Amino acid sequence: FRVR
Amino acid sequence: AMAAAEQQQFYLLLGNLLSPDNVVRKQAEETYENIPGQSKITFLLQAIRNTTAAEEARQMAAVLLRRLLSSAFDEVYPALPSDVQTAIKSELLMIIQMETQSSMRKKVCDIAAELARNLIDEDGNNQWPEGLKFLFDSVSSQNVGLREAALHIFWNFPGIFGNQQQHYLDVIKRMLVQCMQDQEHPSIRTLSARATAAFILANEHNVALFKHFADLLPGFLQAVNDSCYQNDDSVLKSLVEIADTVPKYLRPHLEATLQLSLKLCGDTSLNNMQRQLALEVIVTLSETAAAMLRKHTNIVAQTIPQMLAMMVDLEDFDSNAVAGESALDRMACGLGGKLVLPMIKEHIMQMLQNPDWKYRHAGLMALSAIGEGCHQQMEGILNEIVNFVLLFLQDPHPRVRYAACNAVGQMATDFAPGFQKKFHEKVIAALLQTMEDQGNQRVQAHAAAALINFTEDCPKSLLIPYLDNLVKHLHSIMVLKLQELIQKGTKLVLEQVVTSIASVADTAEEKFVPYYDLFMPSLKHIVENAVQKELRLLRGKTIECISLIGLAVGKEKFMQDASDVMQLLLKTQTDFPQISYMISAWARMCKILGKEFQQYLPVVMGPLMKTASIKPEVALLDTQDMENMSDDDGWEFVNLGDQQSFGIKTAGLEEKSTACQMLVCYAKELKEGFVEYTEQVVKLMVPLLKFYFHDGVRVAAAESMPLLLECARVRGPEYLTQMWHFMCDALIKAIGTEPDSDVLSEIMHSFAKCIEVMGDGCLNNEHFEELGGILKAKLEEHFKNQELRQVKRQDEDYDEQVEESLQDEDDNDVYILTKVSDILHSIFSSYKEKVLPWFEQLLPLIVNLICPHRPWPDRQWGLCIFDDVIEHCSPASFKYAEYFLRPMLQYVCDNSPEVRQAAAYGLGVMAQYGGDNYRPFCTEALPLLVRVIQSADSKTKENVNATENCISAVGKIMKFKPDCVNVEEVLPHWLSWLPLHEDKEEAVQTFNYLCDLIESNHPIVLGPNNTNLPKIFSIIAEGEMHEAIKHEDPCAKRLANVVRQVQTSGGLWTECIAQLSPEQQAAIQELLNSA
Ligand SMILES: [Cl-]
Ligand code: NI
Ligand code: NI
């Protein structure tokens, strides 16, 4: 957004 | 009770509803509207029931009750008493039973079918068995009127059964077969054919049912032909719906279906609408069932002369020529140019050489039409075509010159950028020559239109080499046409020239700077002289040009005229379609002027709210309504069930949306200056969440919400709370009701942002209760869809197109799941441990995402959710460890990099935030994490983020739980794994711990005789990967203090620096000067  | 006296008064109201004078007709419509829906239904049903009353009053009540059950069934029937509900049903069937009048009989069948539709539960079964029973008995019935009534109900709602296949399937088949064979009745055959198509359309994926009903297709086709040669396109429209939604049904008789379409289309005795709709069957098939049509290339080859013949019939959107070129375009696109170009190529060549102009005109339009779908196949003939086309600019017939202009501009779109690269010399010269040197003003205007296409899709690099001669000619044209605008009011060519200058300026950008003074004064003298209503499109195009010129030259060059232009722009409303141009001009003004635009907000905010408040025009009615309003061109319809269609005035929908997007821009870009208009736009945007006519309007309404809360925060928390209270309930109700996945993901993400803005206390108990159920339902729907896709992948209807659809649904479902996690993260961050009791209702569904047999995006996001419970809800989170603790430890070595990342993240925040209860688990986690870090290809593009999070978790165990690990043994290994740079948040975490290790009074991290210092410098020197942000990160200061302390040991400093590359030494300096 990327994110985890 | 006063029931008969109230019904008598209701009967007087029906009369007034049908009064000639609109005074009593409006006073009755106002009164009718205020009668509760629950009273309305009894009043209307009782009016229909009295057959001894005026026929006109009975017809009025039937139409009013049909609308009532459609527009708001839920507001009226569910709340009614059970005896009242039982009476509604039996009465409706009695009305149809005893009715003599066929006009009334049809309307009550519509009311019965709409009621039957809303009496089908979620499990899929009929809650009104008496309706289905009535249908079954009326099929057999000796009364023709009842056979017609059962057929009418079925045509309206063919899903009237929950045992459709189960037993009733051959009852339906026999029923439709008898009513289609029966040539001793006229309306029954037409109704039966339409009922067949409706039953097939209601069983979208039933391949076995299509095989079972393939027998009825030759008969349906006979009814298409029969109704057509009697001016009835009803059954032919049903055929177009078949080809569109369910073409597999046609396969057993496709040759017959195609032949019929070709015959009706090539039949001169039929009207334009019937011939177009027949062509539409073959065109639709090329888009929905191309692989099926590709087997019958013989029919596709015969469709080409038909479409070309339509284009030759010249002498507007609903004309055969326009319908023909549009069909040729869609068909070339649907079937591809490899099949189509060989068929059409020779037809075009012969038409271009034909002595009749109508053939030359059509050959050029057919050339424009096939460019979208045949351009890859046309690249070898492109040079030859362009030369042929350019000579048609000299054709004796002016209309053929206009079509050559059209072809040039269509080629500049379809063949860009290669078209511009190779043909700019011949094309720009021919277009400019036809604009300047030609005497017919209509060819000049068509040539300027093709020049706009050429420059709009010409890349800047390809445009710049000849910009000077282009601008030179356009200036001469603008100047001469401006003289004609002054003395004769002529604007035809000037309109296109102004847009051509704007397109050139928009492409040239800073290259248009030397040309600013050559157009800008002349452009301002065009808007002042365009005060007349006839010059409104010109004044709009000129405002677009001035703003697009200013946007290219920048705020420095445009500044001298920015106030003159802004003032002259607001003069248009005081000295008077053009709304769209003014709205977009202000967007340009703001983008150039930056925060200095703030001073113009009081004058533009007025008309910006006005256009964001435009109301659309609601349309309803039955069958013949969508074709009677095609003249408008700005009125669009959607074919809903019962052939009863919904229409909307497309006219202001794009302006309404654009304006909404401008308010979004102003709230984030002019934050400080927008605060005064916050309460008004909050009231505007909140009901806009349920604007189901424009997707972009709801998106803008959603995007505005967190932006509006940032403005409301400067006022104080009190204004902020009352602003949040305007949107909280509306945002939650939108999450549970939004039909579009893309718009729902926006609503969910904005709700998530607003909670983060508001913090703890932002949600009340009713809003938490509604939210829990809404998120629970989204999760339930996530799991039903996966089961459905699994069964649909083994279906008899499964194919390449179904496969594409299912993967798109899966992607959307995954995206919605990321947003559930987003909403949850902001609730867990705000509320911390207090919200765990509330979270328990979602716990079964969330833990289901982490089941080992679930797809990897399920395990990933289920772990992301449990990572937020650990990070923000500890030490309470350990009460729930029986749900996630062992799965996270097992999921760290998963095949998915995304899953490994989520699990490793959780193991790290368990060390940092969890508490002493996780200590034994912290001990186990370390070797599992080291195993993933050391695994080969761990730092490749696909695995580097998972690995970085494993290194970060190891570090959090070492730092926060030193008693659970042998830090002195892990430390040299962890030091070798640095630096991180992909995950910036985790690069900070490790840099903070590395600083703790170096600053420690026993800094074992340096090694004996500071042997690890060069490695520590290499790690830090990777401040060239932007991991350490000099500003907001305080660890940048700590990393610089560590490094600059080494400067005091000369030899050690010289040796640490000498081992770095020149680009690394310059990064150490950059860091040392900044922090
Ligand atoms: Cl034309
Ligand atoms: Ni609230
Ligand atoms: Ni190692």
Coordinates of N, CA and C in Angstrom, one line a residue, chain A, chain B residues 819 983 985-986:
Chain A
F1 N 0.8 -1.2 0.0 CA 0.0 0.0 0.0 C 0.8 1.3 0.0
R2 N 2.3 -2.3 -0.2 CA 3.4 -2.5 0.8 C 3.1 -3.7 1.7
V3 N 2.1 -3.5 2.7 CA 1.6 -4.4 3.8 C 2.5 -5.7 3.9
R4 N 2.2 -6.4 5.1 CA 2.6 -7.0 6.4 C 1.9 -8.3 6.6
Chain B
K819 N -9.3 -4.9 3.6 CA -10.1 -3.8 4.1 C -10.8 -4.1 5.4
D983 N 11.7 -3.1 3.9 CA 10.7 -2.8 4.9 C 11.2 -1.7 5.7
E985 N 9.8 0.4 8.1 CA 9.4 0.3 9.5 C 10.4 -0.6 10.2
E986 N 10.7 -1.8 9.7 CA 11.6 -2.8 10.3 C 13.1 -2.4 10.2

